[PDB]
Amino acid sequence: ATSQPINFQVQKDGSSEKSHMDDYMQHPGKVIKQNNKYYFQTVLNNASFWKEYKFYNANNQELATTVVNDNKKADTRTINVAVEPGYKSLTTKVHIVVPQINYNHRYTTHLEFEKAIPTLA
Numbered sequence: 128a129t130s131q132p133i134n135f136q137v138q139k140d141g142s143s144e145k146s147h148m149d150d151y152m153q154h155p156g157k158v159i160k161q162n163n164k165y166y167f168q169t170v171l172n173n174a175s176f177w178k179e180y181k182f183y184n185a186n187n188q189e190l191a192t193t194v195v196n197d198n199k200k201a202d203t204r205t206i207n208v209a210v211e212p213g214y215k216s217l218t219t220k221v222h223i224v225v226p227q228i229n230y231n232h233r234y235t236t237h238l239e240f241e242k243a244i245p246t247l248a
């Protein structure tokens with residue numbers, strides 16, 4: 128396995144402004160290459176709030192996500208999002224539910240990588 132840190136910023140639909148969703152993901156992220164796949168690995172803060180999350184490439188096909196750890200006490204979740212070299216921008220569609228404030232909303236954002244996903248060894 129080969130891995131390296133990658134900077135990213137979740138941005139509002141239709142804007143380069145920082146999205147509220149960015150505030151619920153740890154920075155930096157990670158790109159991992161393994162047998163023969165690439166993953167953007169990221170940590171969701173307050174994972175209990177993320178009722179649904181889907182990711183898409185710029186050409187609008189859904190990217191497979193997997194759960195690498197689920198940490199119930201810290202309320203975090205580490206996930207892998209299948210990516211390819213060259214990917215610059217992911218579209219995300221999320222369903223966020225915060226029961227204690229009667230909050231139930233759905234959103235679209237775009238997750239912007241600082242540099243395109245690199246080719247790795």
Ligand code: HEM
Pocket residue numbers: 138139140145146147148149151152173176177221223225228234235236
């Ligand atoms: C108790 C926790 C939270 C509170 C109090 C809260 C509050 C808000 C508020 C006030 C807005 C403004 C809506 C608008 O201007 O139309 C908003 C929108 C939004 N929220 Fe949250 N939110 C919370 C949790 C989350 C979580 C966990 C996520 C996902 C990681 C999230 C992602 C978004 C997104 C994507 C928008 C639409 C505009 C944007 O991209 O920033 N929020 N929320």
